[PDB]
Design a protein around this ligand. Sequence first.
Ligand code: A1AIJ
Length: 421
Amino acid sequence: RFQVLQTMALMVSIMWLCTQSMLENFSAAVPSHRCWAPLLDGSLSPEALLAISIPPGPPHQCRRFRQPQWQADTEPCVDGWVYDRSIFTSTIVAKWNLVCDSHALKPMAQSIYLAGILVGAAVCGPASDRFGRRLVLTWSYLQMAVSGTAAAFAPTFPVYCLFRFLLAFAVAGVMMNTGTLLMEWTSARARPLVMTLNSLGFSFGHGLTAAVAYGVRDWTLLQLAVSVPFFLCFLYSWASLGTLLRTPGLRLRTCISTLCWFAFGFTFFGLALDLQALGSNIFLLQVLIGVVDIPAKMGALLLLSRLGRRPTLAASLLLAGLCILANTLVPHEMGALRSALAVLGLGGVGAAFTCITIYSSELFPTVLRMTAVGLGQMAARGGAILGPLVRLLGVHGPWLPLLVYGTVPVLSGLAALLLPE
Ligand SMILES: CC(C)(Sc1ccncc1-c1ccc(C#N)c2ccccc12)C(=O)O
């Protein structure tokens, strides 16, 4: 009774935590924009007017003819940008003009968020040890709620990034304490099931985010809505690494497990946080991510049970990488196929997360098990921090970030073939 109720509450918390993580692709979606031109803001056709007021692009994002030319002089967006509000009424990109010259700020915002996750885990470890895990979890709920509300009403971009950093600082503690509490009260034999249940809670959070963002098209309102439930969550909440590396034989397993954690984190947080490239419809992609993760993670658990631990992880990582590579390979015209491939890739990445979480426990003796799992978690968080950054390589071509996202998991899975069991 108590175990199931606690599991349900923590599943709800994880759903909302996934919402916090994945909100960025909605609250930071880049709308179609253009320099604010006077002649565009003898009237003629809007298409013709825009043709004589904005140079053509591969509709140029950030240029405008100095004087309306009827038919070099192109100049930057001196007066600002005009954002298309057909989908989103407001966004951080539209609010702070994170386009073109300052385009790197959005992926940099996502990197700051993930660095906040890393720092929050690092601090909450010793804090959760020093103070009760339940107390730290309650304080993390409170911090998540307040940081989300503040970042919703952030006046300037540095303030928004700072409060996203503190929000991540809090979510790291939330995740740490939720996982620890689930582990403590669950029988050692039932650990794979509990891990799968938590991952399924995250999958449900994907669709929850999709629905909330669909309803609330204002980034301020979206952030505030996703942050409010943590107020209620707070209300009703009431063997060192040196030795691990020293051992000679362990080095192979340690390196490969850490590489797998890093590959999962990098690929997921570099792809999951930018679904605009993956598919045309962000809401549909967000929904399908969870809709496929559910069966994907269930099948991952089934294969893990019957097909084995190592081959299941290898298959999941290879599937993710190959699907991402195909997505960047198949023609951009075939949008449906690319969206399906991206959904399959994210499902495989989630399955790989389940597999590695349930596998790294077995790979190492009980004395070093906690240290190995912690090292894997830290590597995953570092890869997450590096995830959004590689999207900056898209300036040369949008295919390069996806090529990196695909070749990382493929190589990690191939390396996963050397694991013992
Ligand atoms: C930081 C991560 C990647 S975890 C994490 C931290 C913060 N935000 C989300 C996740 C996360 C990402 C994908 C998941 C999936 N699928 C997932 C499932 C359950 C719990 C968290 C996640 C790690 O620990 O290395």
